[PDB]
Amino acid sequence: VTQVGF
Amino acid sequence: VTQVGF
Amino acid sequence: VTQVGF
Amino acid sequence: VTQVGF
Amino acid sequence: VTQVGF
Amino acid sequence: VTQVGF
Amino acid sequence: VTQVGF
Amino acid sequence: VTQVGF
Amino acid sequence: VTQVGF
Amino acid sequence: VTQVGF
Amino acid sequence: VTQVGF
Amino acid sequence: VTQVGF
Amino acid sequence: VTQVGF
Amino acid sequence: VTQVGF
Amino acid sequence: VTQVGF
Amino acid sequence: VTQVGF
Amino acid sequence: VTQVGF
Amino acid sequence: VTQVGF
């Protein structure tokens, strides 16, 4: 699980 | 941004 | 952006 | 954008 | 955009 | 399952 | 499951 | 940005 | 599960 | 930014 | 920024 | 589990 | 910044 | 578990 | 900054 | 568990 | 457990 | 357990 939020 | 991963 | 992954 | 994947 | 995939 | 939305 | 939303 | 991963 | 949102 | 991972 | 990891 | 938020 | 890790 | 928030 | 680790 | 917040 | 906050 | 806060 990899999550990138911006 | 809302992220839910499992 | 709403993301749900499983 | 709403994404649901399983 | 609404995406549901399973 | 690959989802791309923009 | 890969989700890209923007 | 809210991220929940497990 | 990879999630990218922006 | 709120992150919960387990 | 709130981070909880376990 | 990797979470990046900004 | 609040961090809880265990 | 790696969390980066800023 | 509040940090609790165990 | 690695947490970086700023 | 490594926590860096600033 | 390493904690750095500033």
Author numbering:
A (entry chain B), B (entry chain A), C (entry chain A), D (entry chain A), E (entry chain A), F (entry chain B), ...: 1 to 6
Sentences from the paper on this structure:
However, while 45LNIYQY50 (R1), 47IYQYGG52 (R1), and 137VTQVGF142 (R5) formed unbranched and elongated amyloid-like fibrils, the 129TASNSS134 (R4-R5 loop) segment formed scarce and more amorphous structures. The 45LNIYQY50 (R1), 47IYQYGG52 (R1), and 137VTQVGF142 (R5) segments bound the amyloid indicator dye ThT and demonstrated dose-dependent amyloid fibrillation curves with short lag times. 45LNIYQY50 and 47IYQYGG52, which are overlapping segments from the R1 repeat, adopted very similar structures. Both segments, as well as 137VTQVGF142 (R5), adopted a classical amyloid steric zipper architecture, with two possible dry interfaces between paired β-sheets. The β-strands were oriented parallel to each other along the β-sheets. These three structures are class 1 steric zippers, as defined by Sawaya and Eisenberg according to the organization of the β-strands and β-sheets. In each of these dry interfaces, the chemical properties governing fibril stability, i.e., buried surface area and shape complementarity between sheets, resembled those of eukaryotic steric zipper structures. Specifically, the R1 45LNIYQY50 and 47IYQYGG52 segments and the R5 137VTQVGF142 segment formed fibrils that bound the amyloid indicator dye ThT and formed canonical amyloid class 1 steric zippers. These segments contain Gln49 or Gln139 (marked in bold in 45LNIYQY50, 47IYQYGG52, and 137VTQVGF142), which are critical for fibrillation and cannot be mutated to asparagine without interfering with curli assembly. The R1 segment 45LNIYQY50 and the R5 segment 137VTQVGF142 also induced fibrillation of Aβ1–40. In agreement with the hypothesis that the steric zipper segments serve as spines of CsgA fibrils, we found that the D-peptides also inhibited the fibrillation of the R1 45LNIYQY50 and R5 137VTQVGF142 spine segments in a dose-dependent manner.
Curli proteins are produced via dedicated and tightly regulated cellular processes, and their fibrils mediate host cell adhesion and invasion, lead to immune system activation, and scaffold bacterial communities known as biofilms. The two key players in curli fibril formation are CsgA and CsgB, the major and minor curli subunits, respectively. CsgA, a 151-residue protein, consists of five imperfect sequence repeats (R1-R5), defined by regularly spaced serine (Ser), glutamine (Gln) and asparagine (Asn) residues. The first and the last repeats (R1 and R5) form amyloid fibrils in isolation and are critical to CsgA seeding and nucleation by CsgB, while the other repeats (R2-R4) contain 'gatekeeper' residues that temper the amyloidogenicity of CsgA.
